[PDB]
Amino acid sequence: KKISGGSVVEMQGDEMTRIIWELIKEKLIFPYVELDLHSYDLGIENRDATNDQVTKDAAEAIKKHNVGVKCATITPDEKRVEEFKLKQMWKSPNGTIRNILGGTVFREAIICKNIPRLVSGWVKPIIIGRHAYGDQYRATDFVVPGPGKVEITYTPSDGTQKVTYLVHNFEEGGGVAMGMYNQDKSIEDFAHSSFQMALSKGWPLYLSTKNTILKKYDGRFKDIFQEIYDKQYKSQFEAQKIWYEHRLIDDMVAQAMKSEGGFIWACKNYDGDVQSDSVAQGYGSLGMMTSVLVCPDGKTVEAEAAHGTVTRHYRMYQKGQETSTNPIASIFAWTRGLAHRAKLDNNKELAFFANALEEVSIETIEAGFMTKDLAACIKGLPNVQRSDYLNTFEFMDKLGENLKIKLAQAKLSLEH
Amino acid sequence: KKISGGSVVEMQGDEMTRIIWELIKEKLIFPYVELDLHSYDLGIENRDATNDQVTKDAAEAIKKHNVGVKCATITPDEKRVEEFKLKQMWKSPNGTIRNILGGTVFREAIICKNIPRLVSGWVKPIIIGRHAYGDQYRATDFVVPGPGKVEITYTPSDGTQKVTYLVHNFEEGGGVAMGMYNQDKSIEDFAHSSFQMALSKGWPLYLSTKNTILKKYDGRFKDIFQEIYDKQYKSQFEAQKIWYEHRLIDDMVAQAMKSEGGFIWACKNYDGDVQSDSVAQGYGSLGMMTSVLVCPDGKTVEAEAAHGTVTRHYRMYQKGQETSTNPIASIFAWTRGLAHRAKLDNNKELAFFANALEEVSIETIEAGFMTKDLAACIKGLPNVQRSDYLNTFEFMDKLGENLKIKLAQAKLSLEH
Ligand SMILES: *[C@H]1[C@@H](C#N)C(=O)[C@@H](C)[C@@H]2CCc3cnc(Nc4ccccc4)nc3[C@@]12c1ccccc1
Ligand SMILES: C[C@@H]1C(=O)[C@H](C#N)C[C@]2(c3ccccc3)c3nc(Nc4ccccc4)ncc3CC[C@@H]12
Ligand SMILES: [Ca+2]
Ligand SMILES: [Ca+2]
């Protein structure tokens, strides 16, 4: 008898992460968990074949079933259009899913005691709450071909007025222009999720903006967060001896860098993207990070592996050359997704399994069993020998081996 | 007789940096150099009093005399408007100056051997080339009060055809919107300045963008850089065994983080702002960074103290209680400004003095004489005692004492 997992929406990806995703399912999930799996192929060839409709359908399924688990995908550029003979240069599927679901993407490093940090002081975790909606990821940008005016206009639905703002009058030559936006309700949900995360972790909360430059745009994020804080969370924060504070982005990055960690950092969409990669790398490895989208309904989540598709590895794998790919972030997309599914259904066994697989992952690396990238973190790539690491299959087999052990011990620990 | 220094534009600033600025002139510059000083008070009260006209006047004076030295200023928001009873929420003076002058702001850490880096690997320097024009710093942002359409339009003055794009149809409630732009000429100047800096330093060059998301806007920065490289700089980069590559910003912050340094990082306006503070902090301190605006003409510069106005120390100072503020970045604005003035006028004496004041500044800190904040970098703020540092005046007096010694030994060393 396997654990009755319930409904999970899965999104298949590309290149090396696609190969690894299938191994995770077959070796670590399917032998122990029985799921009502709703599969959507978000591979570059299937998104092309469906005119990117598959991405939209996957997002609607996540709304219906409340839990999604996503593999890393290619956001194509000119070179990818050539390689796959694409009909169009399809938009980022993470951007599409996030703009349908909305909410906040919570990112945290996956800490293994034997992996060295690149930032000395970071002894406690930094959780980034990245606003998942609008700004640059739902922007309208274009090339300005020559002289002419760029204007941005607002027309209320009542049709009683029109406001025209001059962006720029190009007098000689062209350039680029763009329009972007955000919604009050989305910012409000982003504020609530940031305050709630801070209270659940018992850590202070910092919101970063550039409101001295974007006085109206970033000023609105500052205003909404302060008003929600003062009216609904300030007394709860004081009771927990924590606090909420606004910081200018350039001040905040330096503050985060010299801190000892132990804080929630609410980031606007773009800063969340860039700063979560700097933080992940600061803790030791880019691919050692969780990434969970928490939707405004307080019920729907989408967990993902936020790193790349590992093309260099994929090319080696295609030529039959040996590869050593870190599967941890992809495993944690599954565990964070299964833990949330367990929390919705009150499934103690699924919750136990989700946590056990995270523990096994960390314990295996901590015992000295790891992929070539993690071995290069400790020893340095020139000093790495074949005996120091396990290839992709050896590591997956090793995790499966210890997962079988951990789960056997957990069953054997049960009182008669 | 003092050194004949020539014409320099000085922009006085705000709070703690304003106090330190007058100390630098009185103790380190004026006793040794005689200047045709064109002084502009960019203090918040004088900007309010002149309706920000003094800022525009200072930028025009920089164009005329080719060298500006700027003190850190307050960019007001709602709190600053309430504090100083401001007529308006004045725009950033740096933004005003940069958008009149144009160019690239080159930022690099000020290195002292006794100061520990927060990033262990950075054994070689990272030079950030911040595009000084447009984007967020010349954008049009506004609050969207309720439902309606926000549209962006281009109207050629003499072109193929006009176009209107929907940015967003706000269906329920309001939010925020913004339009921003950049110019081809400004991007081309940014490209040439970046390639020339890499060739002069002998290091590879990286340009960061988010061209996977802003396909047209950021794609143009990527296209302009590549075209200028392929036609005008590739062979020269190959001869020096260096290279130019484009990186996605989120890939770039993680690559920079795990690197050993030793490269030029061409950043877009916003990234240059954010990442320069991350890089300064990583090397040890925010107060240990140079910032020189290099204009496209190859003749005009504006050197500044890129950091804040240090409000807390200014509050302590107002209360009458002892302060210890790092003045090195403010001193280096003067020395970089004066070194460019000397290069323009073929002034051996001014060139010698500028370099001597930099040497003195580094040697003083390397001899264990420093400010409270710098003492906190080696020991950690809770372990720092009144014996570990000098007060603002004490450190300035020590620098002045050591400058007098270096210059006297330099005069005695002269061959008959
Ligand atoms: C300065 C210090 C004194 N005197 C002090 O007691 C605290 C209150 C104060 C905190 C704020 C602050 C800000 N900036 C600086 N120095 C600085 C920064 C960037 C550029 C130039 C100069 N110093 C302080 C100060 C402090 C902060 C941390 C550790 C020690 C001192
Ligand atoms: C050529 C090198 C190679 O031979 C290696 C193999 N097998 C893997 C290699 C690498 C190995 C050791 C140090 C540095 C790099 C690599 N590893 C990863 N890991 C990863 C996995 C999951 C998420 C994110 C990242 N990502 C990229 C590359 C590129 C270079 C590879
Ligand atoms: Ca990213
Ligand atoms: Ca800054």
Distances (CA, A) of B343 to A188, B38, B157, B330, B358: 54, 19, 43, 20, 16
Q: How many A from CA of B277 to the centre of ligand 4?
A: 6
With 0-12 / 13-18 / 19 or more C-beta atoms within 10 angstroms meaning exposed / middle / buried, residue B159 is middle
B151 φ/ψ sector (left φ>0, alpha ψ -120 to 50, else beta): beta
Q: If you search the block for the tokens 């906040």, which residue do you land on?
A: A104
A177 φ/ψ sector (left φ>0, alpha ψ -120 to 50, else beta): beta
Task: Output phi, psi for B141, to 5 deg.
Answer: -120, 150
Stretch (H or E) spanning B301: strand B301-304
Rounded distance, CA B186 to CA B411, Å? 45
Identify whether the C-beta of residue B198 lies closer than 8 Å to the C-beta of residue B264: yes
Q: Which atom of ligand 1 is nearest to the CA of B322?
A: 4
Residue B148 contacts A where some CB pair is shorter than 8 Å = yes
Q: Would you list the DSSP string of B364-416?
A: HHHTT---HHHHHHHH-GGG--TTS---HHHHHHHHHHHHHHHHHHHHHT---
- Which residues from B are below 8 Å from A158, CB to CB? 148
Annotated binding residue at A184? no
Rounded distance, CA B163 to CA B154, Å? 5
Compare all CA atoms of chain A with the CA of B284 and give the residue at the minimum distance. A258
**Closest by Cα among B328, B336, B323 to B291:** B336
Rounded distance, CA B276 to CA B329, Å? 14
B54 φ/ψ sector (left φ>0, alpha ψ -120 to 50, else beta): alpha
Q: Which residues, including other chains, have CB under 8 Å from residue A180's CB and lie 6 or more apart?
A: A134, A135, A136, A138, A139, A140, B167, B177, B178, B180
* Amino acid occupying residue B202: G
CB nearest B277 (choices: A218, A219, A250):
A250
Q: How many A from CA of B93 to the centre of ligand 4?
A: 13
Rounded distance, CA B94 to CA B14, Å? 13
Ligand 2 pocket: which residues have CB below 6 Å? Answer: A 286-287, 307, 310, 312-313, 323-326, 372-373, 376, 381
Nearest CA to ligand 1 atom 4: B323
Beta-bridge partners for B67 = B301
Question: B211: domain range?
Answer: 1-416
Rg (CA), chain A: 23
How do strand A289-294 and strand A104-109 relate by DSSP bridges? antiparallel
Helix (H, G, I), strand (E, B) or coil at B205: strand
Distances (CA, A) of A118 to A286, A379, B84, B111, B260: 11, 14, 43, 19, 11
Rounded distance, CA A102 to CA A300, Å? 10
Stretch (H or E) spanning A38: strand A33-41
Angle formed by the axes of helices A392-412 and A348-366, nearest 10°: 130
CB nearest A140 (choices: B77, B152, B271):
B152
Quote the DSSP letter at residue A119: B
Q: What is the length of chain A?
A: 416
Rounded distance, CA A129 to CA A293, Å? 9
Rounded distance, CA A17 to CA B70, Å? 50
**Closest by Cα among A297, A272, A274, A6 to A129:** A272
Rounded distance, CA B244 to CA A103, Å? 38
Rounded distance, CA B88 to CA B77, Å? 9
Structure tokens, B222: 């990527």
Nearest CA to ligand 2 atom 24: A287
Q: What is the length of chain B?
A: 416
Identify whether the C-beta of residue B105 lies closer than 8 Å to the C-beta of residue B291: yes
How does B171-203 read in b/e, with b if 16+ C-beta sit within 10 Å? eeebbbbbbbbbbbbbbbbbbbbbbbbbbebeb
Listed by number, the residues of chain A in 263-322 with a beta carbon closer than 8 Å to a beta carbon of chain B are 270-271, 273-278, 280-282, 286
Angle at A302 between CA A332 and CA A237, to 5 degrees: 90
Alpha carbon A66 to its chain centroid, in Å, reads 17
User: Rounded to 5, what percent of chain B is helix, strand, coil?
Assistant: 45, 20, 30
What's the domain count of chain B? 1
Rounded distance, CA A52 to CA A244, Å? 40
Rounded distance, CA B210 to CA A274, Å? 10
Q: Which atom of ligand 1 is nearest to the CA of B384?
A: 30
Quote the DSSP letter at residue A357: H
Rounded distance, CA A395 to CA A397, Å? 5
Q: How many A from CA of A354 to the centre of ligand 2?
A: 27
Q: If you search the block for the tokens 């590591």, which residue do you land on?
A: A395
Q: How many A from CA of A255 to the centre of ligand 3?
A: 21
Structure tokens, B173: 């409630």
Beta-bridge partners for B264 = B127, B205
Give this entry's resolution in angstroms: 2.0
Rounded distance, CA B276 to CA B291, Å? 9
Rounded distance, CA B371 to CA B392, Å? 7
* Amino acid occupying residue B163: V
Quote the DSSP letter at residue B134: S
Residue B137 contacts A where some CB pair is shorter than 8 Å = yes
Angle at B336 between CA B331 and CA B339, to 5 degrees: 125
Identify whether the C-beta of residue B42 lies closer than 8 Å to the C-beta of residue B71: yes
Q: How many A from CA of A126 to the centre of ligand 1?
A: 23
Contacts of A195-202 with C-beta under 8 Å, sequence gap 24+, read: A195/A228, A195/A229, A195/A232, A195/A233, A195/A237, A195/A244, A197/A104, A197/A106, A197/A127, A197/A129, A197/A264, A198/A237, A198/A242, A198/A244, A198/A264, A199/A233, A199/A236, A199/A237, A199/A240, A199/A242, A201/A127, A201/A264, A202/A240, A202/A242
How do strand B126-131 and strand B263-267 relate by DSSP bridges? parallel
Q: Flag if A165 and B142 touch (Cβ within 8 Å).
A: yes
Neighbours of B390 (CB within 10 A): 20
Domain at A273, CATH number? 3.40.718.10
Rounded distance, CA B13 to CA B393, Å? 19
Task: Output phi, psi for A32, to 5 deg.
Answer: -115, -30
Nearest CA to ligand 1 atom 21: B287
Structure tokens, B4: 């004949």
Angle at A4 between CA A3 and CA A5, to 5 degrees: 100
**Closest by Cα among A237, A393, A281, A341 to B119:** A281
Q: What is the edge-to-edge ordering of all strands in the sheet holding A301-304?
A: A33-41, A3-12, A67-70, A301-304, A289-294, A104-109, A126-131, A263-267, A205-209, A244-248
Identify whether the C-beta of residue B365 lies closer than 8 Å to the C-beta of residue B384: no
A36 φ/ψ sector (left φ>0, alpha ψ -120 to 50, else beta): beta
Taking one residue from A and the other from B, the number of pairs with CB-CB distance under 8 angstroms is 275
Identify whether the C-beta of residue A187 lies closer than 8 Å to the C-beta of residue A224: yes
Identify whether the C-beta of residue A186 lies closer than 8 Å to the C-beta of residue B175: yes
Ligand 1 pocket: which residues have CB below 6 Å? Answer: B 286-287, 307, 310, 312-313, 316, 323-326, 372-373, 376, 381
**Closest by Cα among A248, A77, A194 to B213:** A77
Contacts of A191-195 with C-beta under 8 Å, sequence gap 24+, read: A191/A224, A191/A225, A191/A228, A191/A229, A191/A266, A192/A228, A193/A103, A193/A104, A193/A129, A193/A294, A193/A296, A194/A104, A194/A129, A194/A225, A194/A264, A194/A266, A195/A228, A195/A229, A195/A232, A195/A233, A195/A237, A195/A244
Identify whether the C-beta of residue B244 lies closer than 8 Å to the C-beta of residue B204: yes
Q: Which residues, including other chains, have CB under 8 Å from residue B253's CB and lie 6 or more apart?
A: A274, A275, A277, A278, A281, B208, B275, B278
- Which residues from B are below 8 Å from A120, CB to CB? 116, 118, 120
Helix (H, G, I), strand (E, B) or coil at A94: helix
Rounded distance, CA A105 to CA A98, Å? 9
Q: Identify the nearest ligand to the CA of B19 by its number.
A: 1
CB nearest B254 (choices: A165, A250, A277):
A277
With 0-12 / 13-18 / 19 or more C-beta atoms within 10 angstroms meaning exposed / middle / buried, residue A303 is buried
Rounded distance, CA B228 to CA B158, Å? 27
- Which residues from A are below 8 Å from B119, CB to CB? 118-119
Listed by number, the residues of chain A in 166-195 with a beta carbon closer than 8 Å to a beta carbon of chain B are 166-168, 170, 172-187
